[PDB]
């Protein structure tokens, strides 16, 4: 989730963005610097 402050300047993290928070597909792709890997991940999510 993006609180809309300065958190998008910090390196993405799967645990705090997609597990502690609800993340968007783009937010997850920001972590897996590979699109296909993100899709895979999303099938679970």
């Amino acid at each position, epitope marked *: 989730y993006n609180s809309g*402050k*300065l*958190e*998008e*300047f*910090v*390196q993405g*993290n799967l645990e*705090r963005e997609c597990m502690e928070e609800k993340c968007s597909f783009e937010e997850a792709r920001e972590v897996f610097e590979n699109t296909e890997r993100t899709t895979e991940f999303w099938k679970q999510y």
Partner: antibody
Amino acid sequence: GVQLVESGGGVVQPGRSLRLSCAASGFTFSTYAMHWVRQAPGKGLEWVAIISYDGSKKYYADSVKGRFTISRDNSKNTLYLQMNSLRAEDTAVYYCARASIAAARVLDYWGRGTMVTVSS
Amino acid sequence: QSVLTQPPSVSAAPGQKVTISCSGSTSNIGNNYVSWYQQHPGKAPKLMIYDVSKRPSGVPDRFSGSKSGNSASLDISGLQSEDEADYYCAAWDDSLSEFLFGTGTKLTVLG
């Protein structure tokens, strides 16, 4: 350990241009966002800019919007502050600062600044 | 703007306690975490407290923080000579989209 050293400071005429450098070491420079903070003689701290860990995004204080440019070279582990159209108000010690790994709002490590005197 | 008001000076004897207030507004303190920085005369600023009351490793337990409304406080107990320095609070401002530093407070350990 986390080391940050600013370079490029000195006297410069108003309306001129100067580039500051910040050599970083002791950490994976690429995974961290960086800040620039300055302090005029006998004054308080003043935020200047911030750049994302990868160089993508960046914000500026209205005081330097349009004149200064913040950049970095993640292969050389260096941070840059390109100052143009310098003024007298830019006279100050310029500090390089690292943002915490999970919070840009936190500057966990600073370096000793570099003095910048803008005078004719 | 930089508003974030702080008392220009606070002091107490070695071993006593002191508290430094950081008065801001909703745009900053009200909705953002406050960090505190220590600055000795000719040294690089140092992070003492972040996210209102979190202490980095290394920072003495005698340093603690608090927040209430649009104000934040840095509390220092058992003052030691090395605590004498300038302190600055800091918070992001949603409205200005800028990181603000308080006006600064000089903490002197009475000698």
